[PDB]
Structure 1
């Protein structure tokens, strides 16, 4: 089945975990501690020297987004056609860009840069509000009328920003409704409330 090898944090596995949970999939968690990692052996066997590492049968994958795309492709969460597939990618790449900025803030200069980052946030979030407004008035998903892997990734991005800058979504009616709507899905709601998710820190440095 599936196996995700990662540190004891949500980080770059939050979205893929929400996807698996919501799709009713079972998976094994192989927790790697900071101690085990610093030993060196595992890091050396990793293609790019980093985690997450994922396994689907004997297929071993690296790169969080490759994992997301793989699951989206095999589980049917990649749009109804090529046009939608292209739009899903465009949304995900957008999410990834903002995620890198978020990660840079958290690990590089949280104390110093937190204020400027929050001020610039509205400009960073507008593109997604726009995408939503152009798709059935933001009544369904980010792309098309069926959920995609980009939805889970965008949802995660939005949730961690709610924690960073509480109320940052107030100015965006469609994103707010979108978050509430997706968070209400049966399997996802159960997962988001579980100790498995809740008791894990968002980032590896205790900042959020």
Structure 2
């Protein structure tokens, strides 16, 4: 069984939660309040002084993308071969890059930086549209014909950007259809509709 240790926010656990839900995996949520975190003891015990912390039986992991890659590896969501595995990494690293830019905006420069960020957004999303266009016309997944951890990470990136800049996918038919298609997967649909997801803020500072 799995345990997710995190703040009461979607943030960097959103993608891995979607993965677990869609894959019909059970997990426990250990919700850490800001007050508990500010006490200091849990933070000091964390490898890089940060969350998420993740438990897979006796194995304890840190780093959101390590968790995603671990679940991808152990559950067979990492491409069909080494070639696809490399492409999956390439997508995920791209998602991470834009997530970092997004987080920087949200937490450090929302008011002054939003206009420039949204203006630059089309150019940041186009690589993912291009990737879909080059994989079976964008009719399946981001890499190959089976779902990967990168799909869940990209899906979250796209969902949070729809909130930040409504209509940001309108120019991108493959990304638009991809979001709708993945979101309609029965277990994922149910999770995305649940208060467990809906009633958490996207970020920790009330900005989105």
Q: Report TM bin, short chain.
A: over 0.9
| CA positional deviation for 1:182 | 0.3
Query: Which string of whole-angstrom CA distances, capped at 9 and with x for unpartnered residues, describes residues 108-138 of structure 1?
Result: 1101100010000000001000000000000
| CA positional deviation for 1:142 | 0.2
| CA positional deviation for 1:162 | 0.2
Give the distance between the partners of 2:169 and 2:59, measured in 1 at CA. 39
Question: Structure 1 segments of 4 or more deviating over 6 A?
Answer: none
The aligned residue for residue 157 of structure 1 is 157
SS of the equivalent of 1:140 reads coil
Give the distance between the partners of 2:160 and 2:174, measured in 1 at CA. 17
SS of the equivalent of 1:189 reads helix
SS of the equivalent of 2:103 reads helix
Give the distance between the partners of 2:85 and 2:202, measured in 1 at CA. 29
The aligned residue for residue 132 of structure 2 is 132
| CA positional deviation for 1:178 | 0.4
| CA positional deviation for 1:26 | 0.3
- Structure 1 segments unaligned to the other structure (5+ residues): none
| CA positional deviation for 1:54 | 0.0
SS of the equivalent of 2:3 reads strand
Give the distance between the partners of 2:181 and 2:32, measured in 1 at CA. 33
Give the distance between the partners of 1:116 and 1:41, measured in 2 at CA. 39
The aligned residue for residue 31 of structure 1 is 31
| CA positional deviation for 1:73 | 0.2
| CA positional deviation for 1:181 | 0.4
Q: CA RMSD in A?
A: 0.3
Give the distance between the partners of 1:6 and 1:85, measured in 2 at CA. 28
Report the TM-score, using the length of structure 2 for normalisation: 1.00
Query: Which string of whole-angstrom CA distances, capped at 9 and with x for unpartnered residues, describes residues 65-86 of structure 1?
Result: 0000000000000000000000
- Structure 2 segments unaligned to the other structure (5+ residues): none
Give the distance between the partners of 1:37 and 1:18, measured in 2 at CA. 25
Size of the aligned set, in residue pairs, is 208
| CA positional deviation for 1:24 | 0.1
SS of the equivalent of 1:201 reads coil
Give the distance between the partners of 1:142 and 1:157, measured in 2 at CA. 13
Give the distance between the partners of 2:147 and 2:42, measured in 1 at CA. 35
